């Protein structure tokens, strides 16, 4: 029972940090993977079935659902970082006076998020998400009053499953 | 892997700011485009259809809806900046003891919001919204107790689509 | 594109302030118009009708409703500033062991709120509200613990229309 | 238009304060009127009837309801200040293993709240409430952790009408 | 009208404090009465019956309900202060793989809470609660991050009546 | 009546602390028991049955339910501390393009949480929970903006009963 | 460009001194105007409103506030120089076991401070302050250790405006 | 306008000194009044209420508070000059392993401070303070390094009012 | 590498001095420019935007703000050097029982500060400040105790920009 | 009224000195009582409860707290004077890679501080402090630059009560 | 162990001095490097992450931040030493009535500070700072009262990293 | 009771001095131990837990924290005494355009500080600190104005524990 015992519990004696990750989408491109500021890893949500047997409840495993994947990115001046979400979302549902759609093999894409170790060139864990299309894109905040902030916005991306 | 690598990801090595925009409405006039203090860009909202196949859910693209467009502007002494919203909204629904209406080609207008680059004379991105009429106008706050504030108010403007 | 350009956008180069207004009611009297500390201007509320045509929604103007008008005033020692709301509200609904009412031409009155310019003797804008009767009067807060505050209370006044 | 003009609007040139009141109940006794720390004056609540005539709404006076009267008092060591609420409330509904009731002429009492002027010996306004019985009594907070506080509790008293 | 007049209103010229109480339960034992840190006295809750007679409402006394009794206690190392709640609650409902119950004369107990005067050896008021069994026990919070806190937890105890 | 009397009430004259615990799961392994930062002990939740007899309510013991067990742990670089929750949860419900399940004897496990005394090598109380499977795993927060924080996440674990 | 040029800039070729003033209050009397040792002239405090227009700030005039007026006077043996502040302040708020107040026309007085020229009999500038009542009076310092000092004290006097 | 004119302004042509006072407490005794080295006279503190009327503020008298009374005394060898503060303060709050209190008529005492004229046998002004009990007693400084100093300490005494 | 090398670095081999300046305001007049004793040149304040990219921060230029301009001047006997600040500030906000204001083109003025070379008749650098109005004027210190000092005071002047 | 009258007020005609004390701790030993250079006597801190009754405040005695006890001692070469604080503090909290604790009867000790009369062999006053354990030990200052100083350090010792 | 042993510890037997440095910026020019009087070397700031494991804290390395770089320089008569900071800062943010900006490759420059040995022609250490732009420039102090001083001012320069 | 009695209290009759120490770090080297001018010994910081039992507080030992270790050293011409801190700190966090890290077994080192007796060759006490890495390094002060000073700087070093 020692205070150095927790470093023995982990490999390399180190802690993972909430920064030192990098997420890339092959549909967006190699420049987008520097643009994504913050996100969350998708949870594994399983509902519970309580079943009554004689005044008491035992619990059995229900059915799996998937929580939505929230990603907030930065924005440059030419707005291509936001337009390439809107163009990718307009394949699904379509926008404008004209109406169009897309087949699910056409707009649903995949993404790879990976966390780095303390050595920044090391890739210690890769997490893959499959079947992605953005649920909502935008709510961009712009004002004359906020002065020193950066222009950013959050998008949510529906997913079928993540390995 | 460098800290200067994020400047390579953006054009011109610079970040877009939440200020340095300017929004004009051709119905209001050239003086209104100096009056609008703060707003938001409209999001692209697409609902999700979860569909059950054998204990699991795959997701397909639903239908597009449009979020409301919230704009808050300043106010001068003569209140023409607010009256020209009320006159534009009275074409739609009408106000007073007399009752009147308007055809949708008569009150629904268009607007252009554009963001500037760090050079203020450069127009780097223009975003057009079509089919606009103000949903609600007002809730103006005025009191003897607030001393150093400016007199401002927020309006919301319904829209059909934005390119 | 200059920082002095916003002063060109307004008449007289000045901003309207949230103070420097004065609201009078002809039913209450000339002494009440010094008593009203804070209020709000009534908004123009128009509901929206989304209508489905082929997977999409266009929006048409709905019907006008009127938001309630909230006024909070000060109070002197003799409580006539509050009693004259209660007497004006007892014409409508009546209070006490006896029961009485009033015809709508008898209790519904009018009011004029006006904002001043930076020169305090100038009346730059007059806003008229028609058909007023107080919805609720009171919720007065009085305690031995609040020491340096002033005794005030808020009333809400139903309205038919405001020009 | 002067800053001394607001003192002309009030009698005696003075403001009413949120303290400098004193509330007595003839059922409780002359010692209770020093015990009541804080309360509120009851509001005059009148609901609104919006009625549709041809796309618009005019408003007519609805029906009067009465808001509940909230009083919070101090407490001495012998708890008679709280017991005399419980005894007065046990006439109405009854408490304990035995069950009892009371006729409404027996437990419903009256109360007089009065506000003083800046001269403390002057009674400038008397407000009478009729038909009082306490709705709930208690929720007393007592703990070893709160150190410098006083022991107090809040009661609410149902009322038929207040003049 | 004096500032020393409030000391005349109370017996012994003193105020009751939110500390300086002590609550004992004969089922728990003489050591538990040092363990209870904080609680509340149970309120006397009586619902109101508004009854319509000709556009107005008079109020008559409804029916008595009893609010739940919330007690939060400290915890020693051996957890007997918490186990003796769980054992007392397992008489009522039972816990574990086996299922059991208890008759209401077996698990429902009584409790005496008493407040002391400023002289700590004086018992100025005793309040008795009858028919007690704990509704929920636990939600204990324990973490490596909270450092200087004490380990405590809150229980709620259902009651039939309190004198 | 003394201030040292509370030390007499407890064994060893000491207080239990919210830290100085350690929770192990035999399914996870001996290295996981250093990883769990914070949790809560599960409560004993028993619903109440109010029953009406002649204007009053007596209360009888209802039925036992079990609150969910919330555990938040740390995370190392290789993410095995999180993967071993996902692998343990994929036995129950299954994840990926393929669909699978598990029998309740296969994924439901047990856990032992124990609190230490002030001497850290002493085990003063062991609490056992039976029938555990994680309800949801994840919602991991990772961002470039949070700098000095540690990477952690919270899981909830359904349980049948705890002794 | 000469060193005698600064004497040309002033009238009479002389400088005003920080002594050679004399302040009188008509409420206090003709003997008080020899008693006031030191004070300050009240400043003209105007807050600033910075307003954002397109990455920059222009400034407009805010609202006037008045700084408090600090006066420190000497003291004679009979303490009438201090008692006549306390009597003048007891008209406003009242002191002692009995409680009293005063109307604002009764305790708010005026004062004239005037600076003399180098000829002491000349009155070169008179400054009037209106609406005065002392905010705090006292903090008198008296000790056996301070030997050669004079007994003095500082008072602060609230003001509405000074011409 | 003369330099001898200031002696005409005062009675007896003399100045009051910061020494030449003597303060006695009837509870402490006739020997304590030689022991008190230094103190301050209590101020008359009245808070200000700024009230907004149309861009400006007029000020009305707020509520009286009382500043604490700071007294520093000498100390003899037997420490009775300090013990008689601690015994007088232990009546209020109590000290030691046993816990006790006191009623406010028992520990709150009165004091008379009086200033002498230049003739030391003359009593020119008596100031009475009522309702005194020491807030804190002690912080005594004792060290081997301070050599020629006297042993002294400062106490603060809460007060209700001073005439 | 020589000690005479620093004289080669500057033009004319000389150093600028903190005296040998002269500041004039065209609104005040030609006599005011001899009156200003001391001031400071306004700084160029630009806030910094730290932006997080992968455990590190790069910095980009924020937004310009302007520090306030502090000027302290002398005072003659007739106080016109101070009155002409108060009259210039009363155009902006107004002072007295009457209330008035001013348009920003009416009270905002300009100023030229210039530093001289060692030859006093040479003007080596002119610095212009635009859009000036005094934020606060006064806090004048005058006392019988300060003997050999000169009567002076400090004013602060808000500015839009300085070239 | 004489200057020899102050010697009559004290016993033995003498003053207590800030030196001529000696403090011993039975846990430390008989050699430590020569080591303690400087300290302070613990104060008696009682918080005040201001309570509002009708625009005024009366004060009642709050609750006793204890200020921390600050002791600074000398240091010899072998550092046992500091190590015996660290060993006494390591019983409470423990230090090093291993983690340990102590029961409060094991590390909390007592101390006796006593002041001497001018005759150094006389013990005129003994003050006892109970329940002591050092809060912090150290911050030792050592440098090559301080030459003629002695090596000393200050410790603070938490206490339950002092007689 | 000798007093000459410290000269053996250093190369060349000598000490580095706080003078005998020289800092040049290639953007400013070869004449600026004689102008810089005083500065500081930038620190290496790394925040600490304390992490709780079982009543104790181990520390791991946090994230690097960079402190601002403060440089104070002299000033000649023509003010080009200050203007060339303002021109370099106006590339970043822009100043005046017109508004402009700059790309970060345009205004961010580099600097080399180097310290000399006791032989002044020897360059013993070169320290490079990258990515520099001045945060604030100015606060220049100039007055008629300071006589023998030199005219100087301090600027702060934001930096990305220093080798 | 003698003045030679204090020499009996210490071993060898002598006092420890604030100089006559020497601190070495095995990571830095044998030449660094002559370079360290001044430092402090780390304190033993233990927070206090006040716990409320019946109007009073007893204190129990909280949790140990460690204060930061501040060391200021000299500097030679070649700056290796400072570079070897920066290189040791760049193992932890990394500096420059490239980003790197280090495992906690790689950068955390140990140090031995020891104090000498009056005989300089005697080592009377050795104090070991474990787990060291510098928190911040630098803030070096260098100027042309400081003439006779030596070039020095202070670093702070985070620590896990010291024996």
Mind spelling out the 3-state secondary structure of G114-141? EEECCCCCCEEEEEEEEEEEEEEEECEE
Distance CA E89, CA F43 (A): 11
HEC sequence for chain D: CECCHHHHHCHHHCCCCCCCEEEECCCCCCCHHHCEEEEEECCEEEEEEEEEECCEEEEEEEEEEECCEEEEEECCCCCHHHHHHHHHHHHHCCCCCCCCCCCHHHHCEEEEEEEECCCCCCEEEEEEEEEEEEEEEECEEEECCCCCCCCEEEEEEECCEEC
Q: Which of K122, K161, K118, K11 is nearest to L81 (CA)?
A: K11
Would you call I6 helix, strand, or coil by DSSP? Answer: helix
F–L CB contacts, 8 A cutoff, strictly below? 17
Radius of gyration from C-alpha coordinates of chain A = 21
- Touch criterion met for I and E (3+ Cβ pairs within 8 Å): no
- Is the CB of residue F54 less than 8 Å away from at least one CB of chain H? no
Helix segments in chain C, DSSP class H: 5-9, 80-92, 104-107
J–E contact: 3+ Cβ pairs < 8 A: yes
Q: What is the largest CA-CA distance in chain K?
A: 69
Gap between the Cα atoms of J25 and J128, Å rounded: 10
This structure was determined by cryo-EM
* Cβ proximity of B150 and C17 under 8 Å: yes
Chains F and G contact (Cβ–Cβ under 8 Å for 3 or more pairs):
no
Q: Tell whether L63 is within 8 A of chain E (Cβ).
A: yes
State in Å, rounded, how far the first CA of chain I is from the last one. Answer: 36
Is E119 part of the contact surface with chain H (CB cutoff 8 Å)? yes
Q: Where are the alpha helices (DSSP H) in chain E?
A: 5-9, 80-92, 104-107
The DSSP annotation for chain H comes to: --TTHHHHHSGGG----SSSEEEE-TTT-TTGGGTEEEEEEPPEEEEEEEEEETTEEEEEEEEEEE--EEEEEE--TT-HHHHHHHHHHHHHT--SSB-----HHHH-EEEEEEEE-SSTT-EEEEEEEEEEEEEEEE-EEEESS--S---EEEEEEE-SEE-
Q: What span, in angstroms and rounded, lies between the C-alpha atoms of K109 and K107?
A: 6
Neighbours of chain G (3+ CB pairs under 8 A): A, B, C, D, E, H, I, J, K
Which residues of H fall within a CB distance of 8 Å from C117? none
Is J54 in CB contact (< 8 Å) with chain C?
Answer: yes
Of G157, C74, G151, D120, nearest to B143 by C-alpha is C74
Shortest CA gap H67–chain G (Å): 9
I144 touches chain H (CB under 8 A): no
Chain F neighbours, 3+ Cβ pairs < 8 A: A, B, D, E, H, I, J, K, L
- Picking from D64, D14, D11, the residue whose alpha carbon sits closest to that of residue D42 is D64
Nearest Cα to Cα of residue A124 among A44, A8, A32, A11? A11
Q: Do residue F1 and residue H98 have CB atoms under 8 angstroms apart? A: yes
Give the phi and the psi of residue I113 in degrees, each rounded to 5: -105, 135
Give the H or E element holding residue K63: strand K56-66
When CB atoms are compared, the residue of I51, I54, I63 closest to B15 is I51
Task: For residues F41 and F43, give the distance between their C-alpha atoms in angstroms, rounded to a whole number.
Answer: 6
- Look at residue J89 and give its three-state secondary structure: helix
Could you tell me which chain A residue has the CA closest to the CA of F97? A161
**Which one, of G136, G131, G118, G134, lies nearest residue G159 by Cα?**
G131
Q: Give the DSSP H or E segment for F24.
A: strand F21-24
Chain K contact present for E163, CB below 8 A: no
Judging contacts by C-beta atoms under 8 Å, the chain F residues touching residue K49 are 148-150
Residues in chain L closer than 8 A to B7 (CB atoms): none
Contact B15, I61 (CB under 8 A): no
Q: Which of J52, J55, J57 to mutate to test the interface with C (most CBs of C within 10 A)?
A: J52
- State phi, psi for C26 to the nearest 5 degrees: -70, -25
* C-alpha triplet F102, F103, F105: angle, nearest 5°: 125
Among the listed residues C143, I151, F116, I153, the one whose alpha carbon sits nearest the alpha carbon of residue D71: C143
For residues G17 and I144, give the distance between their C-alpha atoms in angstroms, rounded to a whole number: 10
Q: Which chains touch B (3 or more CB pairs under 8 A)?
A: A, C, D, F, G, H, I, K, L
Alpha-carbon distance of G49 to B151, in angstroms, equals: 12
The two tokens of residue L53 are 């039992």
What whole-number distance in Å separates Cα of residue K59 and Cα of residue A13? Answer: 12
Q: Where are the domains of chain H?
A: 1-163
Contact E45, D86 (CB under 8 A): no
Q: Bridge-partner residues for B46, per DSSP?
A: B64
CA distances from J83 to H51, J28, J76, L125 (A): 63, 11, 11, 11
Q: Distance between CA atoms of E42 and E46, rounded to whole angstroms? A: 13
Measured distance CA(D34)–CA(J51) in Å, rounded: 13
Q: Kindly tell me the burial class for residue J24, based on how many C-beta atoms sit within 10 Å of its own C-beta (0-12, 13-18, 19 or more).
A: middle
Residue K127 pairs with which residues in a beta bridge?
K113
Contact of I143 with chain G, judged by CB distance below 8 Å, is answered with yes
For D117-123, which contacts have Cβ atoms below 8 Å and span 24 or more sequence positions?
D117/C77, D117/D12, D117/D14, D117/D20, D117/G101, D118/C77, D118/D12, D118/D14, D118/D17, D118/D20, D118/G101, D118/G102, D118/G103, D119/G100, D119/G101, D120/D20, D120/E1, D120/G99, D120/G100, D120/G101, D120/J54, D120/J55, D121/E1
Mutate to test the interface with I, among C15, C21, C118, C119 (most CBs of I within 10 A): C118
Residue F129 parent element (H or E): strand F123-138
Calpha distance C2→K97 (Å, rounded): 5
Size of interface A-G (CB pairs under 8 A): 7
Q: Which of F1, F3, F19 sits opposite L58 (nearest CB)?
A: F3
* Chain H residues inside the 8 Å CB shell of J16: 75-77, 79, 150-151
Give the separation between CA D83 and CA E126, rounded to whole angstroms.
Answer: 12
CB pairs under 8 A between A and B: 137
Q: Report the alpha-carbon distance of residue J28 to residue J26 in Å, rounded.
A: 6
What is the spatial distance between Cα E47 and Cα E62, in angstroms, rounded to a whole number?
5
Residue A60 in contact with partner chain B when CB distance is under 8 A: no
Residue F2: closest CA among chain H residues belongs to which residue?
H98
Q: Do J47 and D17 touch (CB under 8 A)?
A: no
The whole-angstrom separation of Cα B18 and Cα B20 is 7
Minimal CA separation from B159 to chain K, in Å:
33
In contact, C143 and D19? CB cutoff 8 Å = yes
Out of C3, C13, C120, name the one closest to residue I103 (CB): C13
Question: How many residues can be counted in chain B?
Answer: 163
Cα–Cα distance measured from residue B108 to residue B100, given in angstroms and rounded to the nearest whole number: 16
Q: Chain E residue closest to J50 (CA)?
A: E15
The torsion angles phi and psi of A16, rounded to 5 degrees, stand at -75, 145
Beta strands in chain A (DSSP E): 21-24, 36-41, 44-53, 56-66, 69-74, 109-116, 123-138, 140-143, 152-158, 161-162
Q: Which of C20, C147, C148 sits opposite H54 (nearest CB)?
A: C20
Residue D102, both tokens: 């009371």
Burial tier of B9 (Cβ tally within 10 Å: 0-12, 13-18, 19+): middle
Contact I18, K149 (CB under 8 A): yes
Q: Report the distance separating Cα H68 and Cα H159, nearest Å.
A: 7
Give me J89's structure tokens: 């503090």
User: Does the CB of I74 have a partner CB in chain K at under 8 Å?
Assistant: no
**Residue D6 in contact with partner chain G when CB distance is under 8 A:** no
Pick the closest to residue G46 from G69, G63, G67 (CA basis): G63
């Amino acid at each position: 029972m020692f205070v150095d015992d927790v470093t023995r519990a982990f490999e390399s004696g180190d802690f993972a940090r909430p920064n030192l990750f990098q997420v890339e989408i092959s549909y967006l491109g190699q420049n987008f993977t520097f643009q994504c500021k913050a996100t969350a890893l998708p949870a594994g949500i399983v509902e519970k079935i309580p079943v009554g047997f004689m005044n008491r409840k035992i619990n059995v495993a229900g059915d799996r659902t998937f929580d939505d994947w929230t990603v907030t990115v930065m924005n440059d001046e030419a707005h291509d970082a936001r337009q390439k979400f809107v163009d990718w979302q307009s394949i699904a549902a379509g926008q404008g006076n004209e109406i169009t759609g897309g087949k699910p093999a056409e707009y649903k894409k995949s993404a790879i998020v990976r966390q780095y170790a303390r050595d920044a060139k090391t890739v210690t864990k890769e997490i893959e998400i499959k079947g992605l299309w953005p649920t909502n894109v935008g709510e961009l905040q712009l004002d004359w009053d906020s002065n020193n902030e950066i222009q950013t916005f959050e998008v949510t991306l529906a997913l079928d499953y993540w390995e």
